[PDB]
Symmetry: D3
Subunit: 233 residues, 6 copies
């Protein structure tokens, strides 16, 4: 496809979608066997391998609705991908949500215009595939993770002049901010395929708490495992 140089059939029907292509590489190296790298266009690494005997892929998406939308469109339309699980990070809005929690997004709010353009006059609420959601939730619960299922904000702007609205969203139960889910969920719905976002809380927007990769790496691995565990079902 335009942004993915894979040959037909090289991408598995189940795919994990980290924002960071280097995390795709990490996931492939850490969890998968019989790995090949099928894409390095724009450095947006994608890999296919085998996990517990099942083929799976992992494809970076970049950050933001427009970037992930490119990849998701191509994966679905050009590569026949059926199950797409974003494995990402997010920033907690509320004190009640803690760093290293895993958030499974039921739905996402957004400041993107993408859905307003598609559905003028409507608020489109992008919805996770419940099957996948339940699988991931059950896997996370069994794995002993702190799993929160709820609402997230898919933001176009990481750096907002005022966080007032973000705070307000937090007061309405929105758990965390991230930059992809609206697009993933909307496009998956458009094409009748199955999507989920499983997120690790990496930072707390208002408390300032931040983490490096390694500082959330055990939790991150466990999260990847549940995203993979859900995927291979």
């Amino acid at each position: 496809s335009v942004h993915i140089e894979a040959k037909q059939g090289e991408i598995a029907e189940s795919i994990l979608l980290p924002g960071d292509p280097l995390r795709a590489k990490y996931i492939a190296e850490t969890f998968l066997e019989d790995v090949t790298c099928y894409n390095n266009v724009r450095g947006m690494l994608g890999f296919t391998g085998t996990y517990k005997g099942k083929r799976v892929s992992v494809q970076g998406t970049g950050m933001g609705v427009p970037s992930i939308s490119i990849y998701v469109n191509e994966l679905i339309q050009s590569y026949g991908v059926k199950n797409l699980i974003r494995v990402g990070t997010c920033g907690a809005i509320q004190k009640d949500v803690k760093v290293r929690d895993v958030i499974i997004a039921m739905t996402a709010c957004t400041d993107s215009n993408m859905n307003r353009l598609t559905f003028p006059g409507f608020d489109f609420a992008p919805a996770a595939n419940f099957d996948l959601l339940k699988k991931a939730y059950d896997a996370g619960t069994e794995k002993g993770l702190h799993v929160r299922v709820g609402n997230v904000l898919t933001a176009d702007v990481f750096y907002r002049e005022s966080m007032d609205m973000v705070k307000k969203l937090g007061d309405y139960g929105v758990l965390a901010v991230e930059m992809e889910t609206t697009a993933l969920y909307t496009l998956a719905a458009k094409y009748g395929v199955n999507a989920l976002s499983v997120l690790t809380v990496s930072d707390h927007i208002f408390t300032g708490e931040e983490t490096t990769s390694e500082e959330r790496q055990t939790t991150f691995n466990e999260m990847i495992e549940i995203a993979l565990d859900a995927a291979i079902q």
Copy 2:
């Protein structure tokens, strides 16, 4: 409160919210014991009774975001209600959704402006309380119902000059149209309480299929049972 003449403490912390006050009466009469009617302001009947030993209420909401918003605000703010389960009907958008299916709304799309006014520039995705959702889903699954968990449209207009957008939403996986969930979910989130909408598909918008109360009454009863079963947990 302005629209509910109940004394403090007369409304249980768990409440079912049919749109039709006559369905509130039906639910109270059919399922509850030790029933009292605490409201007949505007004919919007509300009852409190006991179900399998647990106090529960049932309160009509009327149709539409503005009507249910009145009642939900009052129930939450004036009567301390904590668990609110709309038990309603809806119109299927897709052929894949069948009359008498039970839909548990994860989230809701809307053509209402209510959330645009609250969150200018954002698409707010109103989210069910996952705990309640899971309880209802599990109860429905155990009850042997066809339960679909997914997205719905909360419509301001029942009678639309064109159903093109509704169809488009259906193509994006939106299961059914109804007229309350956005408000319920948004307000419950605002106030940190727990909401869910459990819906019986009563009609199919495009196929023209329609049902009367009795024609979906067995399924309706089973749905009420799961809404009550979820509530009493």
Copy 3:
């Protein structure tokens, strides 16, 4: 129709539209002769009777644009109703508007999206039928009522986190808040029929002044009389 169980011809061409179905019952019992109740679907009572020799109906609408829109659409499209006069209550915004004043809405502002969806990019100003307006105004003037003809706000939300905009509207001459007129006026215009809203100021939003039915019942009756007097012309 879907929400009205009347047989064809049971609903008169002129109809009063209180929000409260119990007020429909009151109006029928108090003012009409040869009354029959043609609807009790959803408790949304509707009656037809005779007033000073002329057949007239009275139909509750429920609260909010979506609710009244259902009934008005059905009345117009399915029952051939030609003259629709909402007889309602409203909350004064300004000190200059007093409890028990009668407001005849020339037009209505709204926070509803209903007209934005119909007329993207436009502000649609829903307009009363001037003939009816003048009749009601003249009748009210002759009846010795305080009648104010002006602008109202048709609100989707009764319970607003901030009344700043409502206050601002008041500063622009908007007299009172209510929850139906935009829809009535817009739909009547759509279908080329005649609508008016005649409102009793029942409360003052900022002063906190409130009234019960009986506390405005003499004025309310006189208002009903002018709505009927206008209707039978």
Copy 4:
């Protein structure tokens, strides 16, 4: 003021507001005595004179919301003007509205953003002053004119790539298109003063019928007379 070079007190409290400054000149010359021209800034002629013994002014506004808004703001804020009657032309949308009809605008729809900016999330319906409206209506009725009281469209664009929405508005009873009323009515309301627009139908948008000044001059004069007759009351 910035756009009006009149000294304080030179502008009467009642003013007619044609869009065309040359029509202001015509009105002053034709109807007024003891006339002085108080403004020729930007050629936007303004005059004050006496009509049937009462001082009155006439001030061109130019075309469009932004132009009239300038003048109306200045007239109200800087010159203490209290009664403002636009005397304009308009283009009929419907066949039912005929060239040379006089339209008294109750309210106005618009494609302007002016009110969306002032009242985010709301549709503001600009309303005529009913007193003035009634006076003009009664005067027009007594004068034997075809007077239509209703809704108009205040357009920002005279030349629209598609008239579909304009047609749709016509189907919702909007009588005619013009380019000032929203602003006049909104600003008058803002400042607690009295406004009305009295319009002569000069063209029919869809039929192509057009008129020159002289071809509607007798009707135009009669309209000016009612705007003056209303003003001097």
Copy 5:
């Protein structure tokens, strides 16, 4: 055309577009030879003459997007005009922009809805014709003027209840406020013709600094010269 009484061929292909028709007259009298006045409809004077041997016209536009849109549409569509240079005034937003500076608008921001209506969901950035822009810039530079090339605000409202947004725009580099450029640039682009706005800073919005015609007349003349110098190329 509807608003211009010129015969075909009387308007030159290059035209200057002051907002003030009296400035059109000034420009024609001061700079042009062999002048005729081709329009006095609505007092909106238009002239054609010769400048340094080249035919050029000058046409008032009135103030605001709707007014200039009328004239520009007619000039382009009915009179075959190809190069349109607004020669106007503007109010500085920033201290960094000084009275008597000449601003050449690259683009314009707006609070008008005109482009939202044309391009729903999009922000249309109206762009100057670069050729013309460069010509004017080079001419202004050679003339020894302070020329600023940048962004302007095309405002619908001259009199804003709050200048907060205007200030904010100034913080984003918007140089000055005026009331026409969006329309000129958008329409010129629509029709594939060439437009530019060259503005004299006549006032400073926040400092209160104001100028009369004569107080900026030397600079104004030089600006007209560059608009003419650009035009005749």
Copy 6:
């Protein structure tokens, strides 16, 4: 900064901003001397080197407004970057714009909501820094490139269900589609720094014409040279 691991001072004040980090690497390797790679967070390579004796950096941005906004914010706020030149690709909308043309964006249209959120009610037109624009234009002209200065569309969605609006924008002179400029220009303006986008037309949206890196590599190099030539001034 959060997404750039550079130490303070490692990033030059002038920076080129390709969307593709691999193009950053190409630019650094091909044009710069004394190169160091200061960032590989998320694979979003950034380099600093020397070009014709002047320090310059090159930093990938990723695709889309949200991605570039992250990097631009960080570059400006955390690294004191002053001159930012996006060097990108774009898709021609019109036949009149040819593959391998270089487009210098004066401004950008967008379907992003980013500016609507910042400037509610306004259309913000993001503007290039004219100085930089002129430098790049002059350099491109001297280099013998086909340089087009004009308007572009900054799209959030690469894959649009309908290109109707894109076509319409093309009819209004918008030259090409890309996915970053609005953000770059807006943020640069916000922070008072200098931005430009210089684009190579790599594809034609409607004709289907596409190019690989090498197929536009000579032109691409020349474009990079002008972006560098402009930068080092």
